[model samples]
Target: KFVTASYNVGYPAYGAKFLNNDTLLVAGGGGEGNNGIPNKLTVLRVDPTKDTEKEQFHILSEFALEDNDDSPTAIDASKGIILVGCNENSTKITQGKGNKHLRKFKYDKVNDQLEFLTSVDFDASTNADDYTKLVYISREGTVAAIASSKVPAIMRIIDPSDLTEKFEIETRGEVKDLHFSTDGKVVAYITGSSLEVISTVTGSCIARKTDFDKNWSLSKINFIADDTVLIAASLKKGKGIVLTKISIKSGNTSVLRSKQVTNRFKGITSMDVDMKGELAVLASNDNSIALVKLKDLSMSKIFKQAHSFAITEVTISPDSTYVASVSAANTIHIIKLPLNYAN
Candidate 1:
């Protein structure tokens, strides 16, 4: 909480999607600054239709990247096309001193709010670096699949109208997370220490594994199939947290479960996996807030204390029935996944 270069709090990097039941879109933890909090390329619209006395947040527009302390993680919403970007968040979402980002936009969630109809730049004239090994949106979200943020990494396959560039990939490392395999042409990151499978029409790096974790924590990846990529790393943060399953065709790495949390800086914040990937959510480092069941990895305790600050992000709803969280003191919690933990 004490690392500031124009700091940030509670996050929403090109990640954070839920734009239906009462509108929600995050990834701008405090904006408009004199450098007190302004690396925000903007995108926070927790609706109220404007007034009716409801605003736990505001500011629903602005898009400029291709680098600058790149601070807008990754996002991809559907139905009306929504895609956000940013990377090189330097090893972490907030608690900063890292940067890198590209750009792409075209949203319109029903008038004066989703606004920002066009933007897409980065690649060739270059500005993509450090962080963001994922940003996929298919299964009817139109199109998107960008990966850039690491000195020599660049993977693109976008086309949300005009912001075009169909399929591309290049790589290196330093992005602790990525997951896309619902026919998004197999893309999952973490290579060199373990886990790698990228080739959306030849972006290469086809497969690599020796187990996965160089201290993995960008919220535990997904998709338990397509060559198995279901992880939850921390290779050795005081020796706790491990839920491996990598196997890009038997380069083999299977743990599946391991617990050892006795604080020791609790560690491992924010994660949400539910799109039939069988429900799961977590926010760690002391203030636990879990609810897992990725096929019997059994765990449920939606908030052991939830937040004092620094949970950063955790989302669930896609008709799997809500379970959201956000901290760093921006405060927003919604947990409703009880139902006896779906029995």
Candidate 2:
């Protein structure tokens, strides 16, 4: 019930989600540059029952994007579909078309492969550095959202099947992160000092909280319930971190549960709430991972040195049985949760 498996995905992994209890989809790469590390996506099969001395994670399928494309900045999966946000090199942008920053792939579970389905020009930023930094695919696989890091950032709600935009909004700052509500009816996103909740049905921002705390900047956000959102924020100096649960039922923000990290924790690099809404996980730059119980926002467990370096992404499996984290060191580790995580 500890470190069950560890491996390297070959590229620095920035995004990952469980395709199933034993299958993981990881994406990242060295962006368009002289680095020989090519941008690619790989599907890995985790065999936890294998001998402890043997490899537990094995690459089942791999697909390399064009050498000129930006590395995948965000990724999510739903109903056998994987949605990734990566900016295409402007070199390929023609006079009539923009860079397709959103990519869709179908995971062929039967064959252990990834099949490219489609892509869309989800971001209008022309700068080479701007990218689609966040994406979420609804659990039902009907609606999808893309957030780009351009100044006056772009947010688009699209149909996942064809990557067609259904609604688009421009923000005043780069989006740090976003998540679709459990019911798939709304999306909560964070940008600089604000949090906005947008309706999936109307594609309209129904609630906006311009300030959560003075001198604090928002980093990651996710919906814990239809009317509530959980946000990770840090002080301007990066000396402190806070996890706040805000209620937005009346178009107003009210804190329900808020916990500040102890000084030992530097900052949250990534965050994920289990599908059952029972537990939440935070990956931190201090090379540790924290598991919190949702009922009281209390620390359930902490794994120090979860990796050799800052953890880039950590995801709880759909069944809440395992936790996976990846780091800039090109390492992946899977933790088997204890039967009684609350203790």
Candidate 3:
């Protein structure tokens, strides 16, 4: 119903996730990892449902890996395994090349402990400028990764368990987002101003769609159900935000809102759909978080200026209990959700 808590982590968290016991796994260094601080990973322990007086984010653990300076873009968790894709922060002229490695961690869910196992380089390409923005490991043990290099992005299928290499597919454009379909047989990703569906079994592009705004790139994306996806992208010269619903089968898209949330921050910064797939919580490039109803694609609530600057990442709990937001200024804002909102 309201933002109940806000805390300062002193470092930007490009990736964040909410697990049990009010535990949030935060990764990333400063805006460009040049704040002269060691690129550290942290566990923020804070409860939003507690009394209003709980204002601090207790650091349960903090760490830095050998490739900690490698700016991480995304984090994925499945079957007790955690993967953080390393990309060097290249906002400026390029101090160092982002890593092409996966900082791996194993979680003891029952005991609520996350331990860093090892960092494995997935791609040893000549281009250190590329960023490993896309990484996903399927239940069948096949891993999907994309080296988001502008020269030509390559999607590689590897075995994370054994590091076995398979055929690589070229994504015509930089990857904005990707997700496995509910059936786990196909993957939907945005590349070169097109929404493409690929078959995991055959490793082929089954279908492609280019119906959305081409000028502005699609940034925040998540699967709505087995057949649909919610995409938040740039509209016009980076002046507005558009939410769209694209069908995976027909490749048709519908605007989720009547009027675009024009230039609110930059574009949709970070977004995540709920486990039930009915609600989407997203942050803007600057100081706002919103909730959208997937049924009607309605913008229900917008918390304006939730942070000092643009938010970097957002995460909603699987139970839809609370939402966590991280901003560019390294602040974490906790938004409490209505217990029955999911229904």
Candidate 4:
């Protein structure tokens, strides 16, 4: 069975995250009325067991920071902090001049209030185009943000304690995606058509690999094990897409290329692998989600017509009980999985 949560807001972007087992957070996008202005960052909490949204749905805790196009680009909940990212050109003007800012808030469940922690500006030089993508927070209160633009792509390391600027590492190509290892010792980022592995402590690239003729663009990347990675590679030249399982220690690459599934529709925009690395879920541009069993490389489409709008992000719960999807139509859907499915 499937449960749906619809929203009147339109064109939701990359602002979606699973707050906990029972809660979900989302950000709205541009509308026609506000002169291409984006709606405020709205937090929605849903209870799957009850099949209903909680009373605290659509809570705008950051009302004081309104009018700023506070697009929740990325979110993470750890150490009692929730981080949100906003891009330039919002509906309201908070900074007066538009720039990218990372907002940190304290999650006070006791008083039902999300207190403002701090904010960090991405562009210290005041440049307009330095956008951020694929952000993640560490357990030790370290934040990493990657930029997708090729114009001097940067990886900003921020102190989660006070949202202070740490140090930035400039990359060779546009960083398509980023992932930190389980131990947080190594950080891996995919540049335009290449992949580079770097040591977080040393801040140096230890290994770099490239692909030129495959027409494979790295969309999402995740760490399966200490030395293993699962990468979502979209095929621009052919009908099917490719998902690669790479081993850093053994230097082996296994390609599980899907058959020609769609002519115009791309494959695997967002994907998440379970902690055990036994099962993986992929969200495709064809408006479907597929479950791929890693043990045998077998694949199955769990849900078709999952969303009317294009899915921007798909994530599995920490317990792997449900899958959450965010679409461009401003709707967030949570799908219940079958029982007794071990990861």
Candidate 5:
């Protein structure tokens, strides 16, 4: 039942969120190649069962703000709304130019229309920084965003009720990624060479400089369990990587290094854990997909030579039956999980 689709769209960024039973919202860096004529921002509604691009599933939508399409930063779905962030090119100077904004679109399930709700500019002062990520904390109804630059990391906490800014926090290094804890009390951010945990209520740094070696940069951090955390780190060589299991309670760590795959040809770049937290699907730079069992820290290679370019992200379905890997080739490969598997 595993299926995949490869397209020549040349997508660079991959952002995905499950909408319902069969629909997935995917956005990324896609456009014409050096034609100077701009391409519209596209959002695709994916069909899992068919694993094919539905002719009617693709739509070109305008950004509420202009000059904000160089990078598609984040896509999050919750509360019948899809929130997306776009980073404007700061090298240019023009009115209404280089202004990064967080745009909100309300999804109409019945009609399948994405309506614009509102947008807030992040670089109104022309700070030359770009927004990195966005996450909707359903429990608190708060939308958290991070604007990063060579200077420092800037965070914006928006009130979902009014879409207004509530509080802001600044940090020392550029933030690469962010994740909110299940309880919504702690927000973890990956900076240049470290991970920092911040208290959301007080906007204070609760723990600073949780270091990973400079050679090993942390990419994604997810809670496999309440106390157990899974972190994906890319190796300095860029040809291999490691996943570590960390215990928040005891500060114990177990590292699982890739050994089966060729170091130069295969390496994990992005990964997503299943809802049960027992399985992880990883996208490798070698144009392959890997399914890993977290319990024993073992791995199984699924697909190889899967994409013309590097795979950027991988996501497991909420139902845990299918896994999808998106590539720079502008294609998505959907693989079905084994019938009988457990944590």
Candidate 6:
């Protein structure tokens, strides 16, 4: 209910995840030119037990990327390995050679350090405007997925260890969000009015839904259960947003529950479910964030104007005791979830 710790990350944070219950990794920066802000990946240590705000959060380490290279647009991590989406600069991208955009890093938990491991070009689009903007790792650490946010929008499934493509598909529209199922067998993505789930094993479509009620627009998707998916959408004619739960197992898709989140919605910019699946958090472009109980789709609390600007990322700690949210205003806040939050 209270913001236990707040810190300036020194850059526009686009992506963040709690590598461990106490360690957080944030990725962002000023893109491809001399705008003065350098691209960087930073790690922070969180001490939820600390009573003093000043002792709650501390920067563990920082790794700077090339100033000329594209900044990190998205980030995800699993089993001590971090995945980031960032394109090589124009000069570094050869005409015939593929551009290396997906970067890999190893986190040394004991020492609180990061080591660059390898890189891969997930998209082949030659334009400087194209970027690998979304990255996700399956819950079990078997596979990872990456997508380009612009034209020639493509999503690919890869083996996390070697970064080798298992399958790839060109999503006709710009991808709004991507998520992998708990078992790492399927992944779902939303783009335009379409929500499609694909099997990571064969690259085949598992379920597809288009143009909800002809008015609702899909913005984010997550697999709360291996057989079920939760979606966040906004109405085209009103400032209302809805969260819908769909069953995906038996080859029959049916809505199990749906609820309107807000009437003044600017749309949910990001959504994350707690690792235990008992609760979920939604970040909004309205600079607010809401905590919801997953069982009945009920709102527990809404923090209005959680940041000075639109929140770029919101993540629940692996332990589910804390919530971390970031903004383009270079702000990061760690809030303590109410003791009975999941109840």
Winning model by lDDT: 6
User: Native-vs-model 5 lDDT?
Assistant: 0.59
Residue-level lDDT tens digits of model 6 in 203-243 = 98888877477678888888888688888888888788788
lDDT of 5 at 333: 63
How far residue 165's Cα lies from its native spot in candidate 5, in Å, is 3.1
lDDT of 2: 0.81
Error of 6 at 120 (Å): 1.6
Clashing pairs in 4: 67-92, 69-90
Better of 4 and 5 by lDDT: 4
Clashing pairs in 2: none
Window of ten residues with lowest summed lDDT in model 6: 90-99
At residue 58, give the lDDT of candidate 4. 48
List per-prediction Cα lDDT, in the order shown.
Answer: 0.54, 0.81, 0.67, 0.62, 0.59, 0.83
For residues 54-77, what per-residue lDDT tens digits would candidate 3 score against the true structure?
Answer: 435666676674433565666766
Give each model a TM-score: 0.31, 0.91, 0.83, 0.81, 0.77, 0.94
Off by over 4 Å in 4: 1-13, 31-38, 49-65, 88-100, 125-130, 148-150, 211-213, 250-265, 340-343
For model 2, residues 226-293, the per-residue Cα lDDT tens digits are 78888888777658778788998767788888887555565788999887777889887788888888
What are the per-residue Cα lDDT tens digits for candidate 4 across 145-241?
4443426678776667777656678887777777888777777778557777777777766666685346877777778778877676777777665
Itemize residue pairs with steric clashes in candidate 6: none
Error of 5 at 318 (Å): 1.3
lDDT (Cα, 0-100) at 238 in candidate 3: 55
Q: By summed lDDT, which 10 consecutive residues of candidate 5 come out lowest?
A: 253-262
After aligning candidate 2 to the native by TM-score, how far in Å is the CA of 107 from where it should be? Answer: 0.4
Give the distance in Å from residue 111's predicted Cα in candidate 2 to where it truly belongs: 2.2
